Design a protein around this ligand. Structure first.
Ligand SMILES: CCCCCCCC/C=C\CCCCCCCC(=O)SCCNC(=O)CCNC(=O)[C@H](O)C(C)(C)COP(=O)(O)OP(=O)(O)OC[C@H]1O[C@@H](n2cnc3c(N)ncnc32)[C@H](O)[C@@H]1OP(=O)(O)O
Ligand SMILES: CCCCCCCC/C=C\CCCCCCCC(=O)SCCNC(=O)CCNC(=O)[C@H](O)C(C)(C)COP(=O)(O)OP(=O)(O)OC[C@H]1O[C@@H](n2cnc3c(N)ncnc32)[C@H](O)[C@@H]1OP(=O)(O)O
Ligand SMILES: CCCCCCCC/C=C\CCCCCCCC(=O)O[C@@H](COC(=O)CCCCCCCCCCCCCCC)COP(=O)([O-])OCC[N+](C)(C)C
Ligand SMILES: CCCCCCCC/C=C\CCCCCCCC(=O)O[C@@H](COC(=O)CCCCCCCCCCCCCCC)COP(=O)([O-])OCC[N+](C)(C)C
Ligand SMILES: CC(C)[C@@H](C)/C=C/[C@@H](C)[C@H]1CC[C@H]2C3=CC=C4C[C@@H](O)CC[C@]4(C)[C@H]3CC[C@]12C
Ligand SMILES: CC(C)[C@@H](C)/C=C/[C@@H](C)[C@H]1CC[C@H]2C3=CC=C4C[C@@H](O)CC[C@]4(C)[C@H]3CC[C@]12C
Ligand SMILES: CC(C)[C@@H](C)/C=C/[C@@H](C)[C@H]1CC[C@H]2C3=CC=C4C[C@@H](O)CC[C@]4(C)[C@H]3CC[C@]12C
Ligand SMILES: CC(C)[C@@H](C)/C=C/[C@@H](C)[C@H]1CC[C@H]2C3=CC=C4C[C@@H](O)CC[C@]4(C)[C@H]3CC[C@]12C
Lengths: 610, 610
């Protein structure tokens, strides 16, 4: 929760420990004062602290086995007392004794009758970035997550339910997977699977949490590669081993996820963790997505890319041959250079070429409607921020594709209603529609990690550098405008108006226009000093600083090009499996039923070991 | 072959193993059930699997020595039974027993009379990228490639022919060289040479395969540097060793390859493997090509470069002084600026300077004919794709040189036929002919690894980045054309026509022209927003991204500059040895016959060891 509230809670807990002499003796392991208190019978033994902790909780917290046994000899009901305050509600002495790995204290508490199924629904025991650890809500979950196998065996022998869930629905396998240390996690997973004598019901592995994730899916989502390898070791079958050639037969019941709302690969790719992209490098998943991409994903993606390119060619040809007529009125203003205008709806669609344009425009409108019908339910199937905010699963390409379809439909509306100004949505749709073709650059290895470079340059570096650049533009444009306020605009009109001054200074920042010079006339002397300062500071230092930032970003992406391209391949394959019809996408892998191996589907992997 | 077919074959093989109780007992090493089957006499013992494998093949496949001896005690004819299906045709139990290194099983099979010359012509035993290994087609080849020397000795003692070839003609030395692991390969090569008691016939080393490669040539082609060093250890003679100076005398019978169609160095350089360029760094080859390049290659290459430069000077001077006359007709169109045209064949070649031009044009046509006569039979001596598609042996320089000669001859044809439009082939030939002079940059160390940088930037990076760049050009050119469709073209004519809009936006992408600005008139407001987006996205992000890609490509080539330059030196020296007359290229090395060492030719290497 709040850091200040937890600090006040800890300070109040230490204050109530230091104020109470029984709690002070329990903390400091003062056996004489504690025995004088307990042998004495002032009739008080349940003094609670600031968090509602008993004296047994204080004895277990500071590793005081002798003081805890003294507190359990007299009035042993403290072995069945949880805390009664917000940051530690539900925590007993058994939880602290398990977390401190005091095995004799856990033995003594289970001898005195500790609650082995004590569900600690505390604020500090929830999975949150405020808490440093998430060990669970049960003593068995705590003992499995800490790493003491003997305490796990002791709690199981006393009757701790392995199939117990948290507030998030997580069983002990989920919280065991969620731990960062993974050396002992595989052995603890083996121990908890070995103690599943129940085996009735479904196996603990098939138990989903409240998010609907199995432990296999949670190992996929969180990027736990070691637990993923340990899980696939239990689901593989070595067919044969001849010399150095080992042929094994992995099971694809959970990896492929046939007939499910969210497949395993979709959950792996659409994950906020950076370590989830290493699951695609693992042994069954890499061969599975390579088979899917090489057999079905690449030809279908190339066909869709060719259709989209021809569609954009038709839209561009309809933009070029747009119906325009001569201007009716006279150009009274000498600075106005508009000689054509848009024809009316009655004036257009007359000749044969206009009917060809009508056919192409119907093709364009139908394609935009098809685009909207393909993209709109994906914003409601998952979250809008998740669908619009991930690099791997398209992302900004979907936003500009939906914007392109919306602008094409708006152009159609303005065409049918005889509204002037189709140049703005047609230019927007021509820029956005052609730039969306780079989405289909993710289907090729050489060009795919380039769109990721451009994405991590625009939203990565350009959105940070544009504030300093805009500050320099807003300074020097105002300076250049006020130096040329008392000047004739016919000789040097690059700073005549302040919007034009902003645009001209932006161009001079990017060095795409020449410096404003008119040597036939006498420019003001302040312009030369201001432009020398602009050339030193803006065009030389900051522009090449942005060039170096883009170079470092390109190097950072190019050091991990194949991983990002494989992630894009899996994202594209998942999207094509979800959206295309099922008869064009047969089920991947060996059928297995024709070979007598049941209804499961397998992937055969032949490797060259030693 | 196909991955799905091999997967179906393996699944069917495991299905037929699991269905048959004899094969199941042979796989699982169930001695009791197997003895009940064999001691029983249901009169069946040759049940074949899905691949035609016997029960002895299943026993040898899963390392079941006891089950294999039980299957060989009753009906031992299974020791002489190969498989009878496509992926394993010709494979016996001896092959699997050798590959599994079960020495007692190989002893038992040779005791029962296994076929020691069993030629396994299977689909899985062929050298292909589908197969993970290529161990050969014979049990001796399998035992030499796996690494068990005792099984090699056992097979040789029973009469396995060492001089046996595969479907590719490869003997056991070729397949032993083709293995990736090279520590045991030298010892196995020594063992197989030591067992060549035949020594009649030619030595196994001089036995070529179906591609015509000796094991020395195959070690050169595949880049096996360790086997190359081991082969040159057997062909060197240490003349003396005084202090730290060791003078040895390498033999150049196979490295130089006098009087052969394909020399050793040509096969090393024209190799698809990247590791073949390390053969040129080895001890005799480096000194040999350095002697050849320093004595003969560099002066002849500099003479040819000077002749080609003077030839291009003559061609350029004939292009500058091209016969042109005043235009006969009148310039009716105000946008037409053509004032000259080409003179007729009768009108030209009149004055003295025209006769000097005629002499130069005859020189140019003769040089192009000489160029075609030098380059045309090289396209038929080797493959066309091999000759036109390798960086080291010229490659694109040969294509542009042949194109230059073809365009010069086409210009001559258009000159003789009075056909208008010599400017197109003359401009093409002037661009391509002068750019071919960079071919002669490969003869100098400092400038040579620069043409490789440009080649790996054009075909490496430019051919990948040009699709995204063309996408941005096709978007923004159409946007800029439709914003200036309803505008007067006299004020801003950079986007008047769509081809001119494409060209102007390509120039604005490369920042070689200024931004289109006409401050005397009022430009449309959409142009400013579209050009600000073009300046942000195209000229700033993508152009400098391509700059960073070229920087990384230049760094990648510059980290290996000397290796690539030495490869180009060997390629140039091989080309000059092949194409120049023999009297200008004396045989390299010590003659040897005058010193009583036979007809062989030697290279003396003096090195400073310790
Ligand atoms: S006109 C209408 C269309 N217009 C659009 O463009 C719509 C589409 N646009 C969007 O909706 C947004 O761009 C959206 C929602 C997709 C958000 O942009 P993002 O998700 O593509 O941005 P990200 O790539 O995450 O930028 C954050 C940067 O921070 C880095 N970053 C974050 N944590 C990092 C860490 N720990 N170490 C290194 N880099 C880290 C990332 O690598 C990335 O690039 P870095 O590296 O800065 O160049
Ligand atoms: S107008 C008429 C004349 N016009 C012409 O230009 C004709 C001559 N042109 C041609 O015929 C072609 O260019 C031809 C046949 C010669 C093919 O081009 P290439 O063989 O020169 O191209 P390569 O250099 O192989 O490009 C492939 C790139 O892939 C890299 N590459 C391949 N595998 C790699 C690996 N494993 N690791 C690193 N780079 C690898 C290579 O290093 C190379 O450059 P990277 O590194 O990409 O910049
Ligand atoms: C390279 C591109 C060459 C384009 C040539 C255009 C041309 O010749 O212009 C012609 C066609 O004008 C058009 O509008 C053509 C429509 C296709 C444009 C996109 C081509 C993309 C090719 C695939 C790229 C895939 C890339 C994938 C990565 C004529 O245009 P104009 O002469 O301006 O006449 C206009 C007359 N009007 C104003 C009366 C209408
Ligand atoms: C992007 C900037 C857009 C600015 C638009 C200006 C505009 O419309 O001009 C108008 C306002 O002219 C002004 O002087 C506006 C004053 C604000 C300028 C700074 C805006 C910073 C915005 C926040 C940036 C934060 C960045 C933080 C990082 C009109 O100017 P004009 O048409 O030239 O008329 C001049 C007439 N006169 C000569 C008679 C006086
Ligand atoms: C038309 C003008 C007014 C302005 C709006 C135009 C903006 C275009 C050029 C910009 C806006 C956002 C840009 C953009 C958004 C995000 C991505 C995803 C990235 O992975 C590749 C580049 C890509 C695809 C680029 C392409 C160019 C876009 C679409
Ligand atoms: C430096 C960063 C922030 C980049 C991205 C922004 C550039 C700014 C300065 C650019 C982007 C688009 C430009 C722009 C849009 C359109 C017009 C209308 C035109 O008739 C006058 C110039 C004017 C008013 C300019 C002003 C400067 C703008 C707003
Ligand atoms: C004349 C115009 C129309 C066009 C066709 C001209 C193209 C020229 C400039 C281009 C085409 C291909 C280019 C090219 C091909 C390949 C190589 C081999 C490389 O190792 C060095 C650069 C070099 C030699 C370059 C030189 C420049 C060339 C020849
Ligand atoms: C971005 C990459 C793909 C680079 C290599 C390609 C550039 C394209 C856009 C260039 C290359 C040559 C250019 C070109 C060739 C010749 C002409 C004829 C001229 O009268 C009008 C422009 C026009 C029609 C332009 C159009 C744009 C072209 C085709």
């Amino acid at each position: 929760d709040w850091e200040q509230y937890r600090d006040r809670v800890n300070m109040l807990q230490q204050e109530r420990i230091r104020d109470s002499p029984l709690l002070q003796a329990a903390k400091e392991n003062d056996l004489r004062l504690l025995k004088i208190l307990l042998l004495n019978q002032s009739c008080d033994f349940q003094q609670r602290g600031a968090v509602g902790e008993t004296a047994l909780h204080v004895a277990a917290l500071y590793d005081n086995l002798e003081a805890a046994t003294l507190l359990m000899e007299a009035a042993p009901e403290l072995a069945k007392e949880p805390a009664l305050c917000e940051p530690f509600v539900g925590q007993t002495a058994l939880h602290i004794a398990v977390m401190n790995q005091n095995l004799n204290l856990v033995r003594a508490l289970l001898a005195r009758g500790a609650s082995v199924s004590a569900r600690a629904t505390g604020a500090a025991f929830r999975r949150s970035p405020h808490n440093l650890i998430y060990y669970g809500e049960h003593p068995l979950s705590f003992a499995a997550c800490v790493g003491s196998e003997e305490i796990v065996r002791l709690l199981i022998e006393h009757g701790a339910d392995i199939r117990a869930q948290d507030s998030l629905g997580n069983t002990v396998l989920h919280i065991l997977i969620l731990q960062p240390n993974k050396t002992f996690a595989c052995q603890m997973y083996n121990l908890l699977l070995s103690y599943d004598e129940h085996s009735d019901l479904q196996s603990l592995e098939l138990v989903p949490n409240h998010q609907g994730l199995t432990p296999f899916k949670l190992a996929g989502v969180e990027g736990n590669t070691v637990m993923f390898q340990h899980l696939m070791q239990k689901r593989k079958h070595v067919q044969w081993t001849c010399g150095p050639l080992t042929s094994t037969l992995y099971d694809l019941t959970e990896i492929d996820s046939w007939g499910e709302e969210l497949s395993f690969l979709e959950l792996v790719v659409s994950s906020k963790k950076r370590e989830a992209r290493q699951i695609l490098e693992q042994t069954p998943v890499k061969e599975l997505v390579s088979f899917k991409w090489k057999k079905y994903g690449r030809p279908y993606f190339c066909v869709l890319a060719s259709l989209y390119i021809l569609y954009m060619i038709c839209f561009t040809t309809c933009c070029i041959y747009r119906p325009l007529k001569l201007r009716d009125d006279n150009r009274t203003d000498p600075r106005d250079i508009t000689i054509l205008q848009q024809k009316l709806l009655q004036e257009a669609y007359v000749t044969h070429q206009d009917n060809i344009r009508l056919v192409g425009e119907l093709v364009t409108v139908t394609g935009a409607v098809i685009i909207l019908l393909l993209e709109i339910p994906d914003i409601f199937r998952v979250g809008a921020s998740r669908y619009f905010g991930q690099t791997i699963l398209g992302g900004p390409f979907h936003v500009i594709i939906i914007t392109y379809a919306s602008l094409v439909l708006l152009t159609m509306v303005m065409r049918l209603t005889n509204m002037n100004g189709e140049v703005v949505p047609l230019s927007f749709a021509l820029v956005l529609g052609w730039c969306s073709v780079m989405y289909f650059a993710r289907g090729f290895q050489m060009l795919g990690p380039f769109t990721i470079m451009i994405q991590k340059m625009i939203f990565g570096d350009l959105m940070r550098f544009c504030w300093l650049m805009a500050v320099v533009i807003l300074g020097f444009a105002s300076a250049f405008h006020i130096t040329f306020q008392t000047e004739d605009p016919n000789n040097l009109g690059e700073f005549s108006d302040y919007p034009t001054a902003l645009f001209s200074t932006f161009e001079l920042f990017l060095t795409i226009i020449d410096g404003p010079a008119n040597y036939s006339v006498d420019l003001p002397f302040m312009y030369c000093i201001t432009y020398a300062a602009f050339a030193i500071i803006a065009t030389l230092l900051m522009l090449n600083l942005f060039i170096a930032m883009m170079g470092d970003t390109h190097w950072r992406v190019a050091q991990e090009r194949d991983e990002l391209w494989r992630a894009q391949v899996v994202a594209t394959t998942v999207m094509l499996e979800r959206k295309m019809p099922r008869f064009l996408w047969p089920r991947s892998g060996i059928c297995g039923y024709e070979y007598g191996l049941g209804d499961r589907w397998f992937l055969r992997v032949e490797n060259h070991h030693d």
